Design a binder for this molecule. Structure first.
Ligand SMILES: [Mg+2]
Ligand SMILES: [Mg+2]
Ligand SMILES: [Mg+2]
Ligand SMILES: [Mg+2]
Ligand SMILES: [Mg+2]
Ligand SMILES: [Mg+2]
Ligand SMILES: [Mg+2]
Ligand SMILES: [Mg+2]
Ligand SMILES: [Mg+2]
Ligand SMILES: [Mg+2]
Ligand SMILES: [Mg+2]
Ligand SMILES: [Mg+2]
Ligand SMILES: [Mg+2]
Ligand SMILES: [Mg+2]
Ligand SMILES: [Mg+2]
Ligand SMILES: [Mg+2]
Ligand SMILES: [Mg+2]
Ligand SMILES: [Mg+2]
Ligand SMILES: [Mg+2]
Ligand SMILES: [Mg+2]
Ligand SMILES: [Mg+2]
Ligand SMILES: [Mg+2]
Ligand SMILES: [Mg+2]
Ligand SMILES: [Zn+2]
Lengths: 205, 156, 209, 50, 78, 122
RNA sequence: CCCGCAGAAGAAGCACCGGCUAACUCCGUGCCAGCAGCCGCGGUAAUACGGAGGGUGCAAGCGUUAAUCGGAAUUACUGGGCGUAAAGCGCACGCAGGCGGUUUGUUAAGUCAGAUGUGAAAUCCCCGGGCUCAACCUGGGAACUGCAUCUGAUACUGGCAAG
RNA sequence: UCAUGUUCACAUACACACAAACGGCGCGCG
């Protein structure tokens, strides 16, 4: 149910940075970011339309840490919902609870955030929520409980987050270690490099 | 601003006393993303040359299409040798639901929301021929008003 | 069908010889051997300095070599360390007093040997043969060759079946003897084997001789 | 340096008709605003206007 | 990155380079006119930025001088 | 084509036969090897392809390919056959399943083991 | 369901990598052994067999087989054709049948409009709510394209009557 | 009048546009 393998490997394969490490050390220093993964990486065959779509999909999936069945389900729900399908899908992915904690900044990576959620460190509306796929809703306060409030990892994460760029759609208090999920983020607020449209087409062939 | 993309490149042969002579055919399609589309079919002994010829041909003899808000104006059929094509305007956000060649020509044209199907033969060259014919043979409400001698409000 | 060598078919007429000395039959073979040795040595040594044409001319028990090269500065070296060294080694190989001269190729895009060498180097370092060849022809044409032909042959792109491909530009009149056709050959020793390069450069039509 | 006195997303892009973050380099994208750095892809001439 | 002086200038053929020596400096006694390359400098990432004789002027190149930092290689015009 | 014609006698759906009619819409079936032998392939191939005529539980006498190198088959050997043709042999429509009732898995296979009934080495 | 204990501890495989189709190299064999959904591969340099490394795709699953619909406008009502590709009876006459120039009247069967009754609940879909989330459960709608009856319109088609 | 010819086996398959800049301090010419 989780990918258990090299992370910079995933990034190398995609091409982009998927943010699977904390970013203390640059990824170019941590790995050959230029060279593609494997014996035969230094070769670029020209990629078909299917291939390109697949690569982008892989990128997004790796970034968030969603396996295929779950991703497909997300897409179906997004399609069902009114409005633009790709936009909707991105919103759902952001909405995921692990992603929200990462945005707030209690986890250095999404992996870290997921671990915290799993281990029951995070309460949504004063209730320890355990599911990483838990959809957070608008106006939902989500907070670190005091036992995990003493975590040096959590405090380290906060420092890292302070370094990172803060999201407009959340509001987070570092001392209280609580953030209010004010609204589901808009596509302009999310990254432009993600071409959700390719994902939609792929799951619509 | 004249975005172009090559649909299909195919190798074809002629036979001579010696043996076989191979050559390549490149089907390209260019368009400005505001209505104007033009396709070109180049032939040369090697692929890059063929592609270049196709691009030049395509760049000239393009054709303007009355597009309504990034989609078709009404359901339109198109026929040619075997490739018979149907294409229907669809609501904003559906995206282009269209085959291969068809997708290319539409995309360069600048239509963002269509439901197409290629019936009959799906020979790239013919399907492009069909699609361009279909797109051209499509008038707007301005044009119909002009023809019938009425205002657009009377027609709606 | 198998074409005659344009230099050898043109010697005397429009083309000079790369060797100019007299010898009786007693000393003739030996002289030839010496030339072969020295030429082989010189090419081997100054392969990286791009060397187009060695011209040997020995009078009075002494050899005068003339190396035609695209970059003399690298052939001469600073202080003339390498020219001097070469002179002495050449002298030992020959067994006579040596004298090296160095001719500067001002138009190295119009030199068959040089073009072939460049193409071969690219081929060795695994560039796309077609692209390299095209670049070579275009460059020569731009520089102002009245024409150029290039042929490459064998295991192209590491393909199992060998084939020859050639590009021609301008006019390259092989049957006209008064046509100044520069010609040369080279071989790229790739991982898949030898790949032959032939290059013809039609400088123009000489009418004086 | 972004939000300094030259920031390409405050005033406009430096390159002739192409964006700073590198994501877009063709007139087809004319007037899109990126989400890598936030620049608007437009005439660099307008960098002297705004 | 660091520049080079050379005859291997990109995008220019022997039609101009005929007056440089093999190092990348004009021969003494070359007679020159507008647009002749006197010094074939090049810049990485390769850009042909080389000294050309300015428009209008003309003359005979009577001399050259060459100056180099410490820990840097000479060449046969040095 | 004329609506009247259609009304009189409407359009017949094209009843598609199965390419594995001895299975009778079963995913596999048991049978007894009446006879196991080798046979020559069809035209652009050379081989000695192993095949066995099998009396099925439901009466049918089929012939079945036996994939993999080497096999423990002979007369009176109960095996399971599955759907799939060998394009290569004329008239052979069924594969034996390696790794069932009375067929061993292939020896020393490290890949596609699941396809050849081979257990995971350690 | 909550609380406490210890310690990364008890917990990753399956298929595939010639094209379609995302993913390539070396060794072994030498039209043999074998592979295969299609096209094909293998006769001494196998990216197609077998092994290895590397990669790709799914993941507590992954493959194979069977089966249905889709793609298949390949039974074509929507939505096919018949000179030469499969397809015009050898030619006629003709009953049942199908279709019917033009005008007026009447009828109101078809047709159309409106209403009433019904079309069980579950399912599908929408907005909600409850299981930590989901699956799942669930409130209310919508839908259930139908059918029946009654009351209207006379355009068209049908009946009857006259031209 | 003048028949027949064993089996298989045929690759090359992608950037456009862009030509020197702003202030002191001087000297000199008109
Ligand atoms: Mg699961
Ligand atoms: Mg579909
Ligand atoms: Mg001869
Ligand atoms: Mg054979
Ligand atoms: Mg591929
Ligand atoms: Mg082998
Ligand atoms: Mg296999
Ligand atoms: Mg072999
Ligand atoms: Mg294969
Ligand atoms: Mg294999
Ligand atoms: Mg159908
Ligand atoms: Mg038909
Ligand atoms: Mg016939
Ligand atoms: Mg007939
Ligand atoms: Mg007839
Ligand atoms: Mg009538
Ligand atoms: Mg009647
Ligand atoms: Mg009625
Ligand atoms: Mg709920
Ligand atoms: Mg009901
Ligand atoms: Mg009537
Ligand atoms: Mg006979
Ligand atoms: Mg024969
Ligand atoms: Zn940008």
């Amino acid at each position: 149910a989780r990918y258990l393998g090299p992370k910079l490997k995933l990034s190398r394969r995609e091409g982009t940075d998927l943010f699977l490490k904390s970013g203390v050390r640059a990824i170019d220093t941590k790995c050959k970011i230029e060279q593609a993964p494997g014996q035969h990486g230094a070769r670029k065959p020209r990629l078909s339309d299917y291939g390109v779509q697949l690569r982008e999909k892989q990128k997004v999936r790796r970034i968030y840490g969603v396996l295929e069945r779950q991703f497909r389900n997300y897409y179906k729900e997004a399609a069902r919902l009114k409005g633009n399908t790709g936009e909707n899908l991105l919103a759902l992915l952001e909405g995921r609870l692990d992603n929200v904690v990462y945005r707030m900044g209690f986890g250095a990576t999404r992996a870290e955030a997921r671990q915290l959620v799993s281990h029951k460190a995070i309460m949504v509306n004063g209730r320890v929520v355990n599911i990483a796929s838990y959809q957070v809703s608008p106006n939902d306060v989500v907070s670190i409980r005091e036992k995990a409030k003493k975590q040096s990892r959590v405090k380290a994460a906060l420092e890292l987050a302070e370094q990172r760029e803060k999201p407009t759609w959340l509001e987070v208090d570092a001392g209280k270690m609580e953030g209010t999920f004010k609204r589901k983020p808009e596509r302009s607020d999310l990254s432009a490099d993600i071409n959700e449209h390719l994902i939609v087409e792929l799951y619509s062939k | 601003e004249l975005q172009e993309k090559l649909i299909a490149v195919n190798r074809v042969s002629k036979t001579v006393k010696g043996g076989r002579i191979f050559s390549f055919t490149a089907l390209t399609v260019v368009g400005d993303g505001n209505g104007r589309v033009g396709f070109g079919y180049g032939k040369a002994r090697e692929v890059p040359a063929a592609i270049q010829k196709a691009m030049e041909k395509a760049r000239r003899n393009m054709i303007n299409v009355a597009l309504n808000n990034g989609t078709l104006q009404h359901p339109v059929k198109g026929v040619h040798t075997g490739s018979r094509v149907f294409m229907q305007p669809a609501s904003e956000g559906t995206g282009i639901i269209a085959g291969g060649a068809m997708r290319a020509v539409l995309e360069v044209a600048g239509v963002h929301n269509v439901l197409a199907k290629a019936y009959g033969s799906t020979n790239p060259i013919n399907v492009v021929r069909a699609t361009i014919d279909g797109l051209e043979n499509m008038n707007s409400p301005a044009m119909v008003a002009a023809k019938r001698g009425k205002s657009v409000e009377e027609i709606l | 069908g198998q074409k005659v060598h344009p230099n050898g078919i043109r010697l005397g007429i429009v083309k000079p010889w790369n060797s100019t000395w007299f010898a009786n039959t007693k000393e003739f073979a030996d002289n030839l051997d010496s030339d072969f040795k020295v030429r082989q040595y010189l090419t081997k040594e100054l392969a990286k300095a791009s060397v187009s044409r060695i011209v040997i001319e020995r009078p009075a028990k002494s050899i005068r070599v003339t190396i035609h090269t695209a970059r003399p500065g690298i052939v001469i070296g600073k202080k003339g360390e390498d020219v001097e060294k070469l002179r002495k080694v050449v002298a030992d190989i020959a067994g006579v007093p040596a004298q090296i001269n160095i001719a500067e190729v001002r138009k190295p895009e119009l030199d068959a040997k040089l073009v072939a060498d460049s193409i071969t180097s690219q081929l060795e370092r695994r560039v796309m043969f077609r692209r390299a060849m095209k670049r070579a022809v275009q460059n020569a044409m731009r520089l102002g060759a009245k024409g150029i032909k290039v042929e490459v042959s064998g295991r192209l792109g590491g393909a199992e079946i060998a084939r020859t491909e050639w590009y021609r530009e301008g006019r390259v009149p092989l049957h006209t003897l008064r046509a100044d056709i520069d010609y040369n050959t080279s071989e790229a020793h790739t991982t898949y084997g030898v790949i032959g390069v032939k290059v013809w450069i039609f400088k123009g039509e000489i009418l004086g001789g | 340096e972004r939000d300094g006195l030259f920031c390409a997303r405050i005033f406009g892009p430096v390159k002739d008709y192409e964006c700073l973050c590198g994501k877009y380099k063709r007139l087809k994208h004319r007037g899109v605003i990126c989400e890598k750095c936030g620049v608007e892809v437009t005439q660099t001439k307008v960098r002297r206007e705004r | 990155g660091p520049e080079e002086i050379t005859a291997d200038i990109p995008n220019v053929g022997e039609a101009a380079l005929s007056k440089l020596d093999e190092s990348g400096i004009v021969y003494i006694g070359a007679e020159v006119t507008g647009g002749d390359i006197l010094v074939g400098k090049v810049t990485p990432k390769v850009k042909d930025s080389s000294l050309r004789v300015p428009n209008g002027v003309s003359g005979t190149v009577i001399d050259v001088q060459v100056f180099t930092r410490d820990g840097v290689e000479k060449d046969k015009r040095a | 084509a004329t609506v009247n014609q259609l009304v009189r006698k409407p359009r017949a759906r094209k009843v598609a036969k199965s390419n594995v009619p001895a299975l009778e819409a079963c995913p596999q079936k048991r049978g007894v090897c009446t006879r196991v032998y080798t046979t020559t392939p069809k035209k652009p191939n050379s081989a000695l392809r192993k095949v066995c005529r099998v009396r099925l539980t439901n009466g049918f006498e089929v012939t079945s390919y036996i994939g993999g190198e080497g096999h423990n088959l002979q007369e009176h050997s109960v095996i399971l056959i599955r759907g799939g043709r060998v394009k290569d042999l004329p008239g052979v429509r069924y594969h034996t399943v390696r790794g069932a009732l009375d067929c061993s898995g292939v020896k020393d296979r490290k890949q596609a083991r699941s396809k050849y009934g081979v257990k995971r080495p350690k």
